[PDB]
Design a protein around this nucleic acid. Structure first.
Ligand SMILES: [Cl-]
Ligand SMILES: [K+]
Length: 332
DNA sequence: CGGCTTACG
DNA sequence: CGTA
DNA sequence: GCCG
């Protein structure tokens, strides 16, 4: 089993959910305590289990797997022997973990913000609503719409959303296209947000497109929160909150809109499709194993000072020496 | 031992 | 810092 | 926490 998540297919459905979820609890807790290295190892170990074809039943099966060492093997060992791991259970029942998970699940709140609020004695969402001076406008929106934003987004919502996004994009720029990315492109049936990638076949036509799209959406009354203020002034990404029509009502939905020039489209498609761990492992592999710098704009050779002109995601995998993984196999 | 994705708002 |  |  190879060491990078971008070297192995990881499907939606896998066989070690109980073991994976426990390691991901420890990964989350490591992040809450500011140990980004420990988070990564626990996430990578959990990902290794997701790629296995069969359930792990004996400790010997962990031999030869990357990212498994004394600590992660002890966690699996306890789960195999007793069905629970005492370290994991102590974490999930701890007030620190429950409060940090509660606060970091708010749109606009990360680990450092949640940790500050925790040290100040805050424990519940109502504690936050009673301290509005501690909140950015972004966090006020995440708190105001928290119940809706914690409701899982379904495929039915995605199709309705893509319709209204395509309408606004079409009114903003003839011939522009809209591509669903993110978890739903990977085959997930639920999500916490919906990601769309927007481009135009003619390079340059997409300049200034996202503000025109956001204005069309605001005019349809569809935007509840938007981070940029528009009638640097230009922007190409918007992580907004939509007022999605429902039968006789509406529901707030997190939506990401990204504009990219068509020359960068395969890199943008690869980037925004995820998963998050897949992307980190792919970019790490690119830099550390191939000496190339990858992001959502391109693939840069710092020695030749040139960008690789890709026409497809397959082109990028091939240039990196990787077997192609379709999006449904990028669920690391 | 040091590294751990890499951008934009 | 937050977003992905 | 684990790898290079
Ligand atoms: Cl990027
Ligand atoms: K958050």
């Amino acid at each position: 089993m190879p060491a990078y998540a971008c070297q192995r297919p990881t499907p939606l459905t896998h066989h070690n959910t109980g073991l994976s979820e426990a390691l991901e609890i420890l990964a989350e807790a490591a992040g809450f305590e500011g140990s980004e290295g420990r988070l990564l190892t626990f996430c990578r170990a959990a990902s290794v289990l997701k790629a296995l074809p069969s359930p792990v039943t004996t400790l010997s099966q962990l031999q030869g797997l990357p990212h498994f060492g004394e600590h992660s093997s002890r966690v699996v060992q306890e789960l195999l022997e007793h069905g629970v791991c005492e370290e994991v259970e102590r974490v999930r029942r701890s007030e620190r973990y429950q409060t940090m998970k509660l606060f970091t699940q708010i749109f606009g709140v990360g680990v450092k913000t949640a940790d500050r609020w925790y040290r100040e004695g805050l424990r519940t969402l109502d504690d936050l609503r009673e301290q509005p001076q501690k909140l950015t406008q972004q966090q006020k929106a995440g708190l105001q719409h928290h119940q809706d934003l914690s409701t899982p987004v379904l495929r039915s919502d995605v199709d309705a959303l893509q319709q209204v996004v395509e309408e606004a994009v079409g009114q903003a720029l003839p011939g522009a296209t809209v591509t669903l990315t993110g978890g739903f492109r990977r085959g997930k049936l639920q999500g916490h947000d919906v990601d769309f990638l927007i481009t135009h076949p003619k390079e340059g036509q997409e300049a200034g497109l996202l503000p025109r799209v956001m204005c069309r959406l605001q005019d349809q009354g569809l935007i509840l929160y938007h981070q940029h203020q528009h009638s640097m002034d230009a922007f190409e990404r918007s992580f907004c909150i939509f007022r999605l029509p429902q039968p006789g009502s509406w529901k707030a939905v997190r939506v990401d809109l990204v504009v990219a020039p068509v020359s960068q489209f395969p890199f943008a498609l690869l980037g925004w499709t995820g998963s998050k761990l897949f992307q980190r492992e792919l970019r790490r592999f690119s830099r550390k194993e191939k000496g190339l710098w990858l992001n959502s704009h391109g693939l840069f050779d710092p020695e030749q000072k040139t960008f690789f002109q890709a026409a497809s995601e397959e082109d990028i995998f091939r240039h990196l020496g990787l077997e192609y993984l379709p999006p449904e196999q990028r669920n690391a």
